[PDB]
């Protein structure tokens, strides 16, 4: 039936989920994740939303502020609200599967609550689609696809111009922080293709 979910763990504990629709498949996934990694996932949720200080104290206030300042949560919720039913079923099933295990944990904590919750002094709460989405968004996107140093670059360029003069300072910037270097080893060989765009290399946006 559409209500059945089979979970099989192999000899290393790796789980395999068997189900007949999207929501049920991702529910099985969330369920086994909550069994294996609940504390890790709770702490990843707090890291990705900036709510670590709630449980760990004052040493994490600047961290939490920095996380919240680097995203716009309502926009992520708007993206979720635009999903088709099928796509939403991925996130909803996952959250609903974690919650089924979390509710079991909180009903029998004396045997099922991960020891770390007792150590750190709090208990797990349920998850929604936004939370599942934010584990990804807060790691892959907001940390591993969000790298710039342009304000520092401008400060370096200004210091180079003050040391070497305008022209030589721009040329030393191009020696230390080149736009492109043709001797760089490239995953794609030159015979195959090359990138067709050429970029300004003298800060002409403020010329």
């Amino acid at each position: 039936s559409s209500s059945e979910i089979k979970i099989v763990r192999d000899e290393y504990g790796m789980p395999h989920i068997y189900a007949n629709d999207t929501w049920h498949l991702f529910y099985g996934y969330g369920y086994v994740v909550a069994q294996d990694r609940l504390f890790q996932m709770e702490m990843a949720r707090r890291s990705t939303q900036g709510t670590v200080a709630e449980v760990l104290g004052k040493d994490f206030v600047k961290f939490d502020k920095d996380i919240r300042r680097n995203y716009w949560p309502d926009a992520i919720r708007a993206q979720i609200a635009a999903l088709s039913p099928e796509d939403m079923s991925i996130l909803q099933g996952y959250a609903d599967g974690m919650n089924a295990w979390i509710d079991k944990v909180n009903t029998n904590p004396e045997t099922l609550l991960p020891k770390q919750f007792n150590t750190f002094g709090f208990t797990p709460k349920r998850w929604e689609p936004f939370d599942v989405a934010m584990i990804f968004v807060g790691t892959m996107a907001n940390r591993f696809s969000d790298s710039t140093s342009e304000i520092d670059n401008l400060a370096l360029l200004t210091a180079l111009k003050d040391k070497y003069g305008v022209s030589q300072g721009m040329a030393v910037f191009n020696q230390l922080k080149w736009l492109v270097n043709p001797s760089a080893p490239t995953t794609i060989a030159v015979q195959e293709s090359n990138y067709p765009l050429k970029f300004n290399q003298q800060n002409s946006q403020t010329a």
């Binding site: 790298s147 710039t148 140093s149 342009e150 520092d152 670059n153 370096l156 230390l176 922080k177 736009l179 492109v180 043709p182 760089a184 080893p185 490239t186 995953t187 794609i188 030159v190 293709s193 090359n194 990138y195 067709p196 765009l197 050429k198 970029f199």
Partner: peptide, 12 residues
């Protein structure tokens, strides 16, 4: 680098 003439991240 992925490819000839492709620019890297702006990180110094």
């Amino acid at each position: 680098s992925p490819q000839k003439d492709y620019p890297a991240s702006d990180l110094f």
